[PDB]
């Protein structure tokens, strides 16, 4: 079985978290730079870590992945979080109310436009 241990996975996770504008989807250049960017005591571990980072680059290039939020990711999610529509979906588009909604307004004593429509079972 080629399941990778958590020491390999977390070392790969920390490199992705920290050095996205860096190492790419090629294993050979990733191994040649993860050796000096991280002090790893074993060559077997270094190839395992550099291998899983490349597998993470392939996963990153096709949609977002969970557990990873690097420097270009959280700025992407906040820009889409900053949607300010001008259509004003809560505002009036023409309102429709039932019979039971209509007496609520006049019992409160407020003046609103209501288009009463009946609903029955």
């Amino acid at each position: 079985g080629r399941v990778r241990t958590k020491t390999v996975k977390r070392a790969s996770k920390a490199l992705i978290e920290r050095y996205y504008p860096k190492l790419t989807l090629d294993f050979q250049t990733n191994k040649r730079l993860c050796d000096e960017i991280a002090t790893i005591q074993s060559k077997r571990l270094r190839n395992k870590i550099a291998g899983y980072t490349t597998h993470l680059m392939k996963r990153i290039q096709k949609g977002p992945v969970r557990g990873i939020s690097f420097k270009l990711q959280e700025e992407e999610r906040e820009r889409k979080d900053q949607y300010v529509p001008e259509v004003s979906a809560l505002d009036l588009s023409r309102l429709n109310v039932d019979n039971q909604t209509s007496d609520l307004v006049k019992s409160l004593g407020l003046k609103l436009p209501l288009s009463v429509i009946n609903v029955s079972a």
Partner: protein, 206 residues
């Protein structure tokens, strides 16, 4: 008392009735809810949207009463309310938790995410049952947004609405953010509409 300018203004009544906050749960009804008004056919109950306003005004007075603003905590494990509580976090201190509560956050002082509030606000008491329970251990008031079937155990001030709704969670969190900011000093005009758009407090599917 009140200077009688905090009553339900007509355009806010338009916002509440267009975000569909007036309709509640089905013929399920807990006796802890006298906000029910004139049960509609097809098994729908109408919430007296007037009564939600003083409860939102009263809840806003609780949050503004806390000296330090970053100790109030907004909780929403519902998928319809993480954007609302995060936007509530931006406009006030209001240190949020969205998603998983990570039990041991109010107890368990050696947690990395150990938070001690003086007030918590929860979107749904049935889905944030860990938040209200942990607040029952460490002496903390809670403010909930309640349906007409919500588990109101260990729950203080409650704002009756529909947690099943899409727009109602966003608007009520927006209205709560508006009043606590007016009371604190961020807004100076009572009649101003607080020009940031109410559609900011809405979850998105993609």
């Amino acid at each position: 008392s009140l200077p009688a300018t905090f009553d339900l203004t007509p355009e806010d009544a338009q916002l509440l009735l267009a975000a569909n906050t007036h309709l509640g749960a089905r013929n399920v009804q807990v006796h802890q809810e006298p906000y029910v008004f004139n049960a509609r056919p097809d098994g729908v109950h109408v919430i007296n949207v007037g009564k939600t306003w003083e409860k939102l005004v009263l809840a806003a007075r609780i949050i503004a009463a806390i000296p330090n603003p970053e100790d109030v905590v907004a909780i929403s494990s519902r998928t319809f309310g993480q954007r609302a509580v995060l936007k509530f976090a931006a406009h006030t201190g209001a240190t949020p938790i969205a998603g998983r509560f990570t039990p041991g956050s109010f107890t368990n002082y050696i947690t990395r995410s150990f938070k001690e509030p003086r007030l918590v606000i929860v979107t749904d008491p049935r889905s944030d049952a860990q938040a209200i329970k942990e607040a029952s251990y460490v002496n903390i008031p809670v403010i909930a947004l309640t349906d007409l079937d919500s588990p109101s155990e260990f729950v203080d001030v409650a704002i009756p609405c529909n947690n099943r709704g899409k727009h109602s969670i966003g608007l009520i969190w927006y209205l709560l953010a508006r009043e606590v900011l007016r009371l604190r000093g961020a807004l100076v005009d009572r009649t101003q509409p607080w020009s940031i758009m109410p559609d900011l407090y809405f979850y998105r599917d993609p």
